[PDB]
Amino acid sequence: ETLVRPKPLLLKLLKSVGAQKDTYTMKEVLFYLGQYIMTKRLYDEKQQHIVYCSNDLLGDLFGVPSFSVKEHRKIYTMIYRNLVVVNQ
Amino acid sequence: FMAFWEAL
C-alpha cells in the first residue's frame, strides 16, 4: 500500500467524485480516477481503453490530450506527477 | 472501461 497525498488539483478531482480524505493508498487514487473517467464519459465507446481528456481537468493534470489505459507506465508517471509519497 | 482499468 503506497501511501500518498494528492496535490491540490488532483485532490480537487478526487473530491469531485466522492473522496473525503487527504491521504490515500495508490489503489484508492486509481479507483477515484477511474470513477472520474466513467462519470465524465471520457472513454471511447468502441475501444474503451482510449481516454479523451483534452479541454478537461484530467487533461491539465496529465498533460496529454488523450491516452490509452494500455499505457501503464505512462499512467503511473502522469499520476505520480500529481502526488507526494508520504515519509511514513 | 472498468475491465481495462482494473489491469492497472
From Swiss-Prot, chain A:
The segment annotated Necessary for interaction with USP2 runs over 1-86
Q: Where does this protein reside within or beyond the cell?
A: Nucleus, Nucleoplasm; Cytoplasm; Nucleus, Nucleolus; Nucleus
Q: Fill in the PTM field for this protein.
A: Phosphorylated at multiple sites near the RING domain by ATM upon DNA damage; this promotes its ubiquitination and degradation, preventing p53/TP53 degradation.
Q: Where is this region: Sufficient to promote the mitochondrial pathway of apoptosis?
A: 1-77
Tell me which residues make up the SWIB/MDM2 domain. Answer: 2-85
What is this protein's expression induced by? By DNA damage.
Tissues/organs with expression: Ubiquitous. Isoform Mdm2-A, isoform Mdm2-B, isoform Mdm2-C, isoform Mdm2-D, isoform Mdm2-E, isoform Mdm2-F and isoform Mdm2-G are observed in a range of cancers but absent in normal tissues.
Coiled coil (residue ranges) = none
Q: How does this protein assemble?
A: Interacts with p53/TP53, TP73/p73, RBL5 and RP11. Binds specifically to RNA. Can interact with RB1, E1A-associated protein EP300 and the E2F1 transcription factor. Forms a ternary complex with p53/TP53 and WWOX. Interacts with CDKN2AIP, RFWD3, USP7, PYHIN1, and RBBP6. Interacts with ARRB1 and ARRB2. Interacts with PSMA3. Found in a trimeric complex with MDM2, MDM4 and USP2. Interacts with USP2 (via N-terminus and C-terminus). Interacts with MDM4. Part of a complex with MDM2, DAXX, RASSF1 and USP7. Part of a complex with DAXX, MDM2 and USP7. Interacts directly with DAXX and USP7.
Q: Which disease is it linked to?
A: Seems to be amplified in certain tumors (including soft tissue sarcomas, osteosarcomas and gliomas). A higher frequency of splice variants lacking p53 binding domain sequences was found in late-stage and high-grade ovarian and bladder carcinomas. Four of the splice variants show loss of p53 binding.
**Which family is this sequence assigned to?**
Belongs to the MDM2/MDM4 family.
Miscellaneous field: MDM2 RING finger mutations that failed to ubiquitinate p53 in vitro did not target p53 for degradation when expressed in cells.
User: Any idea what job this protein has?
Assistant: E3 ubiquitin-protein ligase that mediates ubiquitination of p53/TP53, leading to its degradation by the proteasome. Inhibits p53/TP53- and p73/TP73-mediated cell cycle arrest and apoptosis by binding its transcriptional activation domain. Also acts as a ubiquitin ligase E3 toward itself and ARRB1. Permits the nuclear export of p53/TP53. Promotes proteasome-dependent ubiquitin-independent degradation of retinoblastoma RB1 protein. Inhibits DAXX-mediated apoptosis by inducing its ubiquitination and degradation. Component of the TRIM28/KAP1-MDM2-p53/TP53 complex involved in stabilizing p53/TP53.
> Per the record, what about its domains?
Region I is sufficient for binding p53 and inhibiting its G1 arrest and apoptosis functions. It also binds p73 and E2F1. Region II contains most of a central acidic region required for interaction with ribosomal protein L5 and a putative C4-type zinc finger. The RING finger domain which coordinates two molecules of zinc interacts specifically with RNA whether or not zinc is present and mediates the heterooligomerization with MDM4. It is also essential for its ubiquitin ligase E3 activity toward p53 and itself.
Name under which the protein is recorded: E3 ubiquitin-protein ligase Mdm2
Organism expressing this protein natively: Homo sapiens
